[model samples]
Target: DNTVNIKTFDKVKNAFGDGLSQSAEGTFTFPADVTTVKTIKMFIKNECPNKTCDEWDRYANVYVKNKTTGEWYEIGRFITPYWVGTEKLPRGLEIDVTDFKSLLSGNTELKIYTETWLAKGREYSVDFDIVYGTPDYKYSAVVPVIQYNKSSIDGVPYGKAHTLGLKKNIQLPTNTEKAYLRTTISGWGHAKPYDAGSRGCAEWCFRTHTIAINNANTFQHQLGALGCSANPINNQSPGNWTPDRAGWCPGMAVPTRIDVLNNSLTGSTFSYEYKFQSWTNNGTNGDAFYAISSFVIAKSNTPISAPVVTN
Candidate 1:
């Protein structure tokens, strides 16, 4: 709702059949010299179909990749209505990407990853709206988004602890005024014929994740809690799939957390880590695969751009 111009990347990908990729992509072209920008917002809408009693939950993972640097960053993810008897809810989510204003310039790419493996596609479409406007805040410089997806590349097995670290390596941009750390994480596990919570620390278990910065625990929260009453999908699903889960629920969005770190993290090497709770694995235990993506949004004191005149 600004007086400036806005750009959008729209795509519609129809499912070929069942158990196929529902993912789609669109490209965005931004102005080369982006000094008059105020903010950038990422908007997404998914309308995936479901047959009666399909027995699967679907979600969308939205990402933006800088073609110039070949880096992909997750904007966020959202879950669809429970496939229970075919319930349909189409909601579009929007996020403030002002932190990434510097990257919005030039050409950009959008990715809508339709999760829920072995998907039976209906008609699913994705929308990526990149809005550009004039100043509502102070100036900034180049914003760097560093990543650490190590121990998780091969997946975090059920019987081990996976450490998600960023500060151990990546250095922040110089002369930064403010910074933010964003994380997206999801879990998967099952005991097969035994079920998720067969053992004390099995699947569908509630576990606490520790977020530490500079060797200190700044936040603690248990992500995977199972309560069928939480959402209709949890209760409407056929049978055992409806039981409380430790970290995942069928027709809902996965867990994502964002925290504000020290602005002083400008020059000094800072750290960002997410340690999963310990769980044991039996021969029949399915492992928990965590895909962790993080980014550091820094504000530089270096004078960026401001509106000199309207175009």
Candidate 2:
């Protein structure tokens, strides 16, 4: 078993909505060894470099860019707590990202973003620890099926969000042995259409999302309340960090859902559709939205190609 450590960012300043606001992009060159990759763990470190950290909880994302087509793919996501400087987070946040091995290998371009609307933001450092081992099966391709953020800032109604580009067809390789879908979704905003307890829709409310493959219901993504009190970084006080928000908790990574497809469907063209719970926003409490990304990973014993998406 071989393990390698790649330092991507080191105490990168995420400040100034004045100029370099919200996001930062960098390139990382990973190991090019021919060994079969088993796992990749990402560590996100946030510390106050001058006793100033963003006091508001914000949505954050880690993305990998495709050098060939210039497309950015979201590989990891986390939410920033009210403050991350007062206490040292036990080795920061660790996340497993083995599913994106196909895209994370070799020379890679990465972007980290924190949606903090402040003149001065926080600082984050990232590292990727990779483990090499024998895989049960070789992964061939990772194709992004759905990648978009629909929010009230875009002025899109709840019912019209994520549905405009709903229909897509993908052609799998003939040598595909297994196909799996990886989906990540997180809601935001304190918009209207609150629940019975007066909780806002999208973020504070619970809703179930469904995905269909080949015109049949394949999986249901449930946004149940993940207990916020159970957060590992429990030092976030005076900032309402104990309240559950849809499917994610502040100071934690958003969970990714995986669904396996039948092998019989391989080597065929199939369509996909995402359906959200029936709800309409009247713009009462402004609006709400969901940040979502989904990818189809194909595995095989032999050399394989990525699935072709035809809209």
Candidate 3:
């Protein structure tokens, strides 16, 4: 635990029943028992007239006192427009508590004030909801595993196909050297690369095709990775092949079988499945690198029967 201290205002009140205006301000204190605070969340509600209004600006400012010198310091501030209506409740704001925690642990007193602004000749009602708590989890990355179907010979019925899975798009954390990938497969010898020739083609294609056909077949996978580039223009490299370097399946080269190690990925497992082709191939012994074709995170987990929201 760090030796930092923080002050938080969970609740506040105005002794008089008067409303707040453009220049109005008030103060609130932190609870006694709480120690170092790392983060804060604030919530507020407002009520205003519907007709003849331009806009309203509201501000929430926080100040903290130094216990030793009895001095107050301006910690931070947040602003919002006066949203008047019963249609939606006020939302909360989140803040990092690094400095506040430092002062609070030293037994300092913390105070906060809020100011509201209303258009001339216009009146509005305002309420505030405040919450301050630490986050339960911090997510650094998200990995997604894709699954799909392979067609059987004679084109009678589709066969089962699965991927070792996908991982969150992230760099290995500092001091983290390795990760892993795993998947289950059935009704096939094993996973293979799309360009593994006859063996790989057996699982995905009916017969060996020329380079033109193979290149076209693999275009979608390359395009998927390319589009996902956050800085697409500057970082353009077909297929976003960086992840493949870390043992991800369907690398640049086609293969017959592929698998990932467990310690190679960060975060939880996400699954994706589709039917694009019905063949698999292990890479040639000479060059183990190859490509695999299948669907990635193209769809959300929403149920098919759920109503689509339109507004």
What are the runs in model 1 whose C-alpha is more than 4 Å off? 1-11, 14-22, 30-41, 48-55, 84-91, 94-98, 116-119, 128-155, 161-167, 191-203, 224-249, 301-311
Best by TM-score: 2
Ranking by TM-score: 2, 1, 3
Displacement of residue 80 (Cα, Å) in model 1 is 4.1
Please provide, for model 3 over 1-311, each residue's C-alpha lDDT reduced to its tens digit, 9 standing for 90 to 100. Answer: 23322223333421112463332333434444332233433323223345232232223334455454454544434332333321233333333333233343334455454333333322223222222344222111112232222211112122233343322222333332233222212122223454334333222223322111112231122211221122211221333323211111221111112232234232323222222333333344212212222211111122111111111
**Which digits, one per residue and each the tens of the lDDT, describe model 2 over residues 1-311?**
78888899887766555576678888888887533888888989888654387777777888888776898888888888776542456567878888777778788899888777776687888998888899867666787987874221432235435535767898889999888888888877676667878878778888898898899988999998889998778877777999888899888888988989888789999998877788877676766777788888888888888888878
Candidate 1, residues 186-283, lDDT tens digits: the string is: 55555433433463343455667776776788767565564545664434444444555655555555555667777665567655555666555554
Clashing residue pairs in candidate 1 are 38-133, 167-270, 167-271, 204-246, 205-246, 224-246, 224-247, 226-245
The lDDT of each candidate is 0.51, 0.79, 0.28
> Which candidate should be chosen as best, given lDDT against the real structure?
2
Point out where model 2 deviates above 4 Å.
49-51, 85-88, 150-157, 160-163
- Each model's backbone clash number: 8, 0, 47
Per-model TM-score versus the true fold: 0.70, 0.93, 0.26
